[model samples]
Target: KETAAAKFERQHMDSSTSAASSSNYCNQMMKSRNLTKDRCKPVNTFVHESLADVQAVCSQKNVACKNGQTNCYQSYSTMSITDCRETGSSKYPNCAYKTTQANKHIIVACEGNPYVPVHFDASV
Candidate 1:
């Protein structure tokens, strides 16, 4: 019988094999669907550290302005994280680990192009 550590290693190897097989199957399916390699490019869509930074910019601009006014606030502190997925693929990648602290709210430009924030949670 294998030792516990050996068993763990075996299981890890099996899991890796399964993952590689799955990846290969998906690639085959992509080719069958006439998808170009460029179309398979991964898209990263997640709440990043930049989000908190943008929120801080909004807070600084709003702190001195009147409260409860639309113009006074350009961003929100809390946001729901919906699905982040590839535009045309089934893969939904995870967010890269962020080391920066993130603030609660964020601000957006009048045209909704940029997000400015005031605080961030830096705790690991």
Candidate 2:
């Protein structure tokens, strides 16, 4: 089984991906990154920043988790992220996504043991 840190790296980390890389990024990355394994992730955002910078969100201001968890934290600065929304017509085994990029202060839930991002709760 993948660890929380591994999952975080797959779903959220993309340090070298340029902000203006490609519109097909999500369609390609979501599956390529294994986020489409069980089912296509409905919506996900990939941060275009260093892993260290992203991990430092744990030291940022506390925030309300979407599911009411207390581990959530919001980034201090707006970061470059690509929001991937699965297309309505997408089907299993061939997921499609509409990719859009934005500079948003992301909200993420951190794990207790590793104290790093484990869930992508939301973006603001």
Candidate 3:
């Protein structure tokens, strides 16, 4: 058996992992969206603020463990890459995708003993 505080800590850690996974999912979703013509615009936006909201909720739920310390998480700006080359073949080609072409990098930072970055690369 574990104390309430220990259980809370475990839950908090799980929440953090879940949040990070969700962020990855969001990145993939955004990539899939960009594959379409309408959503493949040059100026693509990454919804980092939305992800931050999730993190905030997790931080609040675990506030008891950290003495109500404010845990801050920031997401870097969205990066845009060139569209995939259109080939006459049935399958589309995305070999030309390059991180260098990206406009920015999505980095998440959490307030803690040692600040670590959670990167969500949105490169094509």
Q: Cα-based RMSD of the predictions, in order?
A: 18.2, 1.3, 14.5
Model 3 per-residue lDDT tens digits across residues 36-120: 3343322232332333342443333221222333442323333232222222331222212211122332323244333332222
Against the unseen true structure, what C-alpha lDDT does each candidate score? 0.29, 0.88, 0.30
TM-score of each: 0.18, 0.93, 0.19
Instruction: Give per-residue CA lDDT, model 1, range 18-41, as digits (tens).
Output: 122232333332333233234442
Q: Over 4 Å off in model 2, which ranges?
A: none
Best by TM-score: 2
lDDT of 2 by residue, 1-124 (tens): 9988788889888888758478889998899899898887788889998998888998898988988989899999999999999998889878999999999999988886658888788889
Best by lDDT: 2
TM-score, model 1 to reference = 0.18
> Candidate 1's error at 122, in angstroms?
17
